[PDB]
Amino acid sequence: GLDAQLTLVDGSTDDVRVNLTLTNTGDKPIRLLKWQLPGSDDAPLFLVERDGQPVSYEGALIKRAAPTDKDFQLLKAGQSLTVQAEVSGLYDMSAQGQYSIRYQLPARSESNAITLWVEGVNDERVQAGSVSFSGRCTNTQKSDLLTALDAASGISNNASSYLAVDGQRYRSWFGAYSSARWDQAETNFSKIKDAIDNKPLTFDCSCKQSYFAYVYPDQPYKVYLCKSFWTAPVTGSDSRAGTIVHQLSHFNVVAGTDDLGYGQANARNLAKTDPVKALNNADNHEYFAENTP
């Protein structure tokens, strides 16, 4: 027969990783549908409950045709296959509480349940402004993102306060003074602040490219984080907080900023060279907010 044993992995992030051992206890090989083994494609393979109530599935749903021979994994007689899954990135395990997790048996009926207390992401934005996730953001990621968002709120309020008392910081990132350009920058930060505070934001963690993040400017307010987001400091230069300000600025409904080159020296040269371009550049907005130093 087919035996499925789930065990919790011990670690010190807030992620919820599990080891699933599937074992052919019979005497002839069996075939397991690969789409129903945990892996890089999303499917709802687990029953996740908090305090006896099902939580949301948070992954994608795929159309696949009927499977063919190539779609099945062979397990020999006696043989075990162990696969690890991170569960918090595919089910909503954001609320604190006692959870049970079982795996459903793949096509050729459940593992044991495991149970654990989950600290959760203790934030009203995840339970006007809200924050949702996709692309397998784990509890640690979600928590890191909310942290980054509060930091971003801190620097976007600080930018906005600076701009409300109508100037080196402005000079550095936006160039020679004009009231029209200052009012424009102030309007941009007002809208960035209003998105941080009040809009339905979405962060996605699927991107593995080496840069920081990307958005589609006509698809508010979903920000895709990439590898350099995670390696960046929460605050300071080219920081997580600053990245959020950068990316939010691109949305057509926020500030419609452009990509007019990349980096601090680029940004400084724009300011010195062509204030109108600086006013239209995401980086200049980020660096004005980061104000580091």
Next chain:
Amino acid sequence: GLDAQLTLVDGSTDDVRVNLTLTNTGDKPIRLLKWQLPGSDDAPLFLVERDGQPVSYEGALIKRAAPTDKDFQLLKAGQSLTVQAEVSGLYDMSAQGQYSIRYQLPARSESNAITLWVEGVNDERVQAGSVSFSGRCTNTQKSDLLTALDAASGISNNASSYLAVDGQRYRSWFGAYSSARWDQAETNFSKIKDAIDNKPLTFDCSCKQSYFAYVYPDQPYKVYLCKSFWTAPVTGSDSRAGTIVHQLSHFNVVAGTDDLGYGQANARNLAKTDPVKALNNADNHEYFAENTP
């Protein structure tokens, strides 16, 4: 110096491919910022105008740090590099008319302009219901998708009409009759029809996986098409039209269908075995609408 020559590629799809030749005409190697050469990462590298007016950039915007040595491409003295780009997937070239396209010179100022008449995607949905795109859908793709959408509308109206006169087709895909389950199916198709007709749909062409499509059920109404969408027939079994019905059915605001296995035999067994599961399965909805035969 650096010379940039753009030429149009002749072909018989509606895509707009161009060959960009960059040439170091000087005597020492030069370095070209790779991020500003056309490639797999989106940036707005071209000036695209229709009838002398700029059209929208339709690609993503990325945060990158200042570039380092590794980010520059070397071009030797005398040397040319030719790179091809498809332009309709990154700028809005959906309206019929006369277009000019120039490339902006990368960091180390424009190519010649090329001009061409573009047939466009001649559809009010792209100019209540609308259709937007991301993930580099070309004019041919956009046109194929609108075609598929009209086909999907055809089969979703036909499903809805069938369900309005209150039964083999129902039996095949939804199992034994009950008024509650029939009303539920009718409500599901009413909402699928209303999304096809009246909602802001988004199709994305970036996915290269071998299956048909995927959605996030909490991210309406963006459908990601994958390789099997393009190889599928427009109508019939496992068709483009049917895929759209499948995927739209998954959205929480449409019909909240599940992924309860994959394929026609799966679907038929659900119906025979467990009508409540069939009523909750995307495929059963697709196959009921495809009704092939």
